Design a protein around this ligand. Structure first.
Ligand SMILES: *CCC(=O)N1C[C@@H](n2nc(C#Cc3cc4ncn(C5CC5)c4cc3Cl)c(C(N)=O)c2NC)C[C@@H]1COC
Ligand SMILES: [Cl-]
Length: 280
């Protein structure tokens, strides 16, 4: 189906090197000229998603549905945005924003030391940006279902971009279930809400302030649910302020209705940024 407003000429795309394997599908980096049609030949580095060589008809419909979902959700500075597609005269290419610094977990773990060592204010800024992206997704009735630092990408300009949204019988056996990021009611029922996303955001906050730590260190998966239901929660990360830990703890309220909304989390993290600039 034709959609000129999103179509890019193949002649203006130069496909480049692949970007890793098996987590966001078959992705390659590319140079695209004239994405914005009012900017003449302005060059832009992009990430391209395409089908595998042995792809089935269902795989094509899946990628087309993912593309249509990106068109419907709309644009926001803190999500991986759709820039356009090559749908005519060749294989399907879905162009999205390129994030040079990789996923947030690896970005954090590489900046624990060295000249590019992240400051406390940089970590608060990262959390604020992810909350803004999630506030946007929730406003568009989109539940992420897998919010975690591994699913946030970082641009050359350190902009946080939520990725792995859009795409999203369990009782029969045929990426494992992300149990350590799941709200107790999500673990229990295997149902997701914006409120279970807020719990996941709390775990992501803990990932940010531990600079990529692994949640619930030392807890066997068979003990996790009982402990969370009894009120067990992760301890405050070292160097983390009491206020930020209270935000994490409110994200992890046992009652989904008592957790903050993403709109409230944006406000709370904006407050923490202000108070951080005063205690230094
Ligand atoms: C998975 C990890 C891995 O291989 N790499 C490569 C590196 N990478 N991955 C992406 C991407 C992407 C992406 C994300 C989406 N979320 C939704 N959707 C559409 C609905 C289907 C997409 C599509 C794609 Cl292509 C990028 C990027 N976009 O720039 C990058 N850049 C390096 C991340 C990770 C390495 O991390 C250390
Ligand atoms: Cl919300």
């Amino acid at each position: 189906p034709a959609d000129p407003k999103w179509e890019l000429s193949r002649a203006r795309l130069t496909l480049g090197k692949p970007l890793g394997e098996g987590c966001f599908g078959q992705v390659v980096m590319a140079e695209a000229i004239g994405i914005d049609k009012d900017r003449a030949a302005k060059p832009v580095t992009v990430a391209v998603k395409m089908l595998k060589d042995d792809a089935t008809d269902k795989d094509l419909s899946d990628l087309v549905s993912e593309m249509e979902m990106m068109k419907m959700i709309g644009k926001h500075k803190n999500i991986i945005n759709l820039l356009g597609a090559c749908t005519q005269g060749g294989p399907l290419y879905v162009l999205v924003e390129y994030a040079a610094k990789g996923n947030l977990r690896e970005f954090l773990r590489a900046r624990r030391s060295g000249e590019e060592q992240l400051t406390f204010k940089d970590l608060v800024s990262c959390a604020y940006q992810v909350a803004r992206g999630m506030e946007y997704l929730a406003s568009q009735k989109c539940i992420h279902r897998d919010l975690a630092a591994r699913n946030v990408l970082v641009t050359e300009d350190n902009v946080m971009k939520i990725a792995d949204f859009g795409l999203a019988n369990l009782d029969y056996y045929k990426g494992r279930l992300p149990v350590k990021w799941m709200a107790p009611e999500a673990l229990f029922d295997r149902v997701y809400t914006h409120q279970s996303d807020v719990w996941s955001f709390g775990v992501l906050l803990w990932e940010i302030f531990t600079l990529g730590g692994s949640p619930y260190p030392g807890i066997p998966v068979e003990e996790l649910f009982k402990l969370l239901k009894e009120g067990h929660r992760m301890d405050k990360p070292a160097n983390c302020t009491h206020d930020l830990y209270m935000i994490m703890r409110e994200c992890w309220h046992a009652a989904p209705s008592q957790r903050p909304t993403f709109k409230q989390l944006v406000e709370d993290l904006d407050r923490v940024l202000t108070v951080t600039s005063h205690h230094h």
